[PDB]
Amino acid sequence: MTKLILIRAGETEWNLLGKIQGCTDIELTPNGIQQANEVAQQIKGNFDIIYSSPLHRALITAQKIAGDKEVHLIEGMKEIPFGTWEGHTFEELNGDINYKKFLSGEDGCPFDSTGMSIASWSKKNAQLLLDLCKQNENKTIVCVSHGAWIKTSILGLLEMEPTMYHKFQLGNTGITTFIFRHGHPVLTSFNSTQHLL
Amino acid sequence: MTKLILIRAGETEWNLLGKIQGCTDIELTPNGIQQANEVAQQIKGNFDIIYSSPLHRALITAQKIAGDKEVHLIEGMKEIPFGTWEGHTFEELNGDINYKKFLSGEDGCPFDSTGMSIASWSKKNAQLLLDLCKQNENKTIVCVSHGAWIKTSILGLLEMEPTMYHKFQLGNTGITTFIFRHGHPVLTSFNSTQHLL
Known about the structure:
Two copies of one chain form a homodimer.
Chain A: E1 3-8, H1 13-17, H2 30-43, E2 49-52, H3 56-66, E3 71-73, H4 97-104, H5 118-135, E4 140-145, H6 147-158, E5 175-180, E6 185-192
Parallel strand pairs in A: 1-4, 2-3, 2-4
Antiparallel strand pairs in A: 1-5, 5-6
């Protein structure tokens, strides 16, 4: 009954460049809008309620999916801040100490100098998503958000070590779904992208 | 680049009952065959080599997908034996000590009285798939196999605790994909089933 659907925002120019957006409010590419429409077509109108991050790339994606429904903004669902890392590619971060930890597992995998980590964001976002699911018990919930945000959410809900973050790759408009088999969540799909051409 | 595609076999009557097949060679339902067509239609022959479990439910699904190509049998790809538990639902196993261990984590989560577990199958199936990937370095490899076999493969490739098995739910003709970034495997999709009508 209670079904959770996590959808990554559509494509942006910074995505194509490998440029870390984080909180930077970059707009969709024309292809990123096509992606939003194709994922909107896949979902049809199935969900009961749809939430979104307020960032444009996410919000526009959610509005295509929503069709006639309201899109409920959730600031908490905004992309994880990458701080100083924002504006750079990962290749440029090679001489960063916190990036060396981010990969290794040290200090729960720090996001630059944001004071926060894969470990903290996992607990935090998981707790958010669980509260939403309680709020909408026995409904199908769609949440449109971002790559880091969604990946930490997955680790959080499933209770996975922070270094598992680097073993999941999540695409633009990638569908990731949970159900709750006991009281705990169960992953039913991850990064389903068959709706794209 | 090396791409791995793990596909679960089509539906059977034992699947609809929640009945544990394991090694028993149950045939597809007419719907299971319709699923096999649909997944074959999605894949569109878009792979370089295809391997399969020799059990009919898997092999027939591989044959639909393969179309023109040869389906390479691998005995090691056959569904994990469930021994004692084969021919039963999970609800029937309530009084089994090994089933309580299978859930909890004890002894690497034993599969009945087979002398084997989620832990041992994880290492073993991980190992097999890596050898297959080495043999076909830089090709797109399809492997048709079964629920438990694929889930243990995921845990083994991603190096996860046996108990995580109960947090993944995989469907008939569910697509699951890996690539290899930095030498190590990265999950790009799990249980993608948008091809099903």
